[PDB]
């Protein structure tokens, strides 16, 4: 039923988006508001295939009434996951601070935990001083370059046919900009590599005798035995990436 004060000379009704949301009765004198039928998106939450075969279903942006019991979250309706009381690290993110995990074994939804609580004592005249150290080594991985490609418009858009090539001339020069952009990218890749790696003006050589005060650098220096002359870590990195 209509709630707005319809002016007694109009028939239809529209909104900011210009969509019909009011129709005058053809047989009586009344206006009816039209609302779209409920719809939403469906998401599937599953662990690895070779660990189980159960799943959970999330209906996005809808209440559970419009559809291991049901559950209502700020992101929508969850079916197939059992709510718990604890809090762990997030395993499969779902929505506003709600995660799901696999743990008999079932699928449990919970609230993620930020971290372990701590409270350092503070006072007006106290200090803490360390008495020992630890040497730590960590890794950082960064991409530097990309694959360099080139294309041919005539061979791609048309095959060996000549009618297609003749008709292609009516489109102007829409096939010379592409080559320019691809060539620019290809040159930029080499520029990136040269900027990153070419930092030394001379090639240095390590002394044949390797005794650096007790330190051992054998795992990072090049290995003469291998034909490629690469360190074991470099060889492992090259083998790991396909």
């Amino acid at each position: 039923e209509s709630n707005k004060k319809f002016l007694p000379f109009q028939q239809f009704g529209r909104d900011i988006a210009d969509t019909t949301d009011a129709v005058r009765d053809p047989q009586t004198l009344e206006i009816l508001d039209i609302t779209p039928c409920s719809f939403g998106g469906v998401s599937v939450i599953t662990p690895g295939t070779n660990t189980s075969n159960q799943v959970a279903v999330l209906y996005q942006g809808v209440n559970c009434t419009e559809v291991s019991n049901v559950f209502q979250t700020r992101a929508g309706c969850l079916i197939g996951a059992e709510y718990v009381n604890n809090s762990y690290e997030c395993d499969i993110p779902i929505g506003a601070g709600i995660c799901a995990s696999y743990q008999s074994q079932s699928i449990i939804a919970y609230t993620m935990s930020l971290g372990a609580e701590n409270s350092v004592a503070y006072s007006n005249n106290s200090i803490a001083i360390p008495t020992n150290f630890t040497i730590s080594v960590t890794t950082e991985i960064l991409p530097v370059s990309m694959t360099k490609t080139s294309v041919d418009c005539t061979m791609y858009i048309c095959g060996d046919s000549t009618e297609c090539s003749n008709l292609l001339l009516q489109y102007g020069s829409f096939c010379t900009q592409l080559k320019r952009a691809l060539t620019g990218i290809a040159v930029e890749q080499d520029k990136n590599t040269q900027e990153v790696f070419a930092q030394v003006k001379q090639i240095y050589k390590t002394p044949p005798i390797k005794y650096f005060g007790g330190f051992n650098f054998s795992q990072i220096l090049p290995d003469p035995s291998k034909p490629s002359k690469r360190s074991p870590i470099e060889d492992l990195l090259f083998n790991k990436v396909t």
Partner: protein, 237 residues
């Protein structure tokens, strides 16, 4: 020793603990390999690029066999079956579709190139600062107090091994901002005053090494009235 002196630790700390530091470094270098060996997700960034490229190319090829609102996706059949004056429409539709696909691919590659270049610039800056020198910026070259770094190569990327220093085995102590003696205040040159319960010493701020208090380690600079919390104790001359 020079690198140790660059973070606030004297050289005698290293010179009297050479074997322990060397053993720790060797153990860490030996253990670093298994971290890369397992958890293959670690080299995700170096792999996605490859995958992405392949995917893109595949899609483009798979876009060739599409009707695009025409009778057939093969030029020869369109030419043979329909007379040339009408086949122009179908040929034009196919041309427009393929041109759109090529433009989309080119634009996507152009967008990706900028992110790749930004990553390369960051890597170049890291190589300039962490490797060829020592860095004071926090959490830039590792996690902790930076000592050194080592580069390695990888398919379409670089790997940095950061060697840093971390304190451990802390202990509680009582401190005072200054020391009162003969009506004069004394402040530490470098370090901090610490009391073990009965006596008072002056130490560094990153390694417990107490020393007796002497006018060599302190400067007077003022009187014994303005400062709040000043305690009084004798000073060896």
């Amino acid at each position: 020793a020079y690198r140790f002196n660059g973070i606030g630790v004297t050289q005698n700390v290293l010179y009297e603990n050479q074997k322990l530091i060397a053993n720790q470094f060797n153990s860490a270098i030996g253990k670093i390999q298994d971290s890369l060996s397992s958890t293959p997700s670690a080299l995700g960034k170096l792999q996605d690029v490859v995958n992405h490229n392949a995917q893109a190319l595949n899609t483009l090829v798979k876009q060739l066999s599409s009707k695009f609102g025409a009778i057939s996706s093969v030029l020869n059949d369109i030419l043979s079956r329909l007379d040339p004056p009408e086949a122009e429409v179908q040929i034009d539709r196919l041309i427009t579709g393929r041109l759109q696909s090529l433009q989309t691919y080119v634009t996507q590659q152009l967008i990706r190139a900028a992110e790749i270049r930004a990553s390369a610039n960051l890597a170049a800056t890291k190589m300039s600062e962490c490797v060829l020198g020592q860095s004071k910026r926090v959490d830039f070259c590792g996690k902790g107090y930076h000592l050194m770094s080592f580069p390695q190569s990888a398919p379409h990327g670089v790997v940095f091994l950061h060697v840093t220093y971390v304190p451990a085995q802390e202990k509680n102590f009582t401190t005072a901002p200054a020391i009162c003696h003969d009506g004069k205040a004394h402040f530490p040159r470098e370090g901090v005053f610490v009391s073990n319960g009965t006596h008072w010493f002056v130490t560094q701020r990153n390694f417990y090494e107490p020393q007796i208090i002497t006018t060599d380690n302190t400067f007077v600079s003022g009187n014994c009235d303005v400062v709040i919390g000043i305690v009084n104790n004798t000073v060896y001359d």
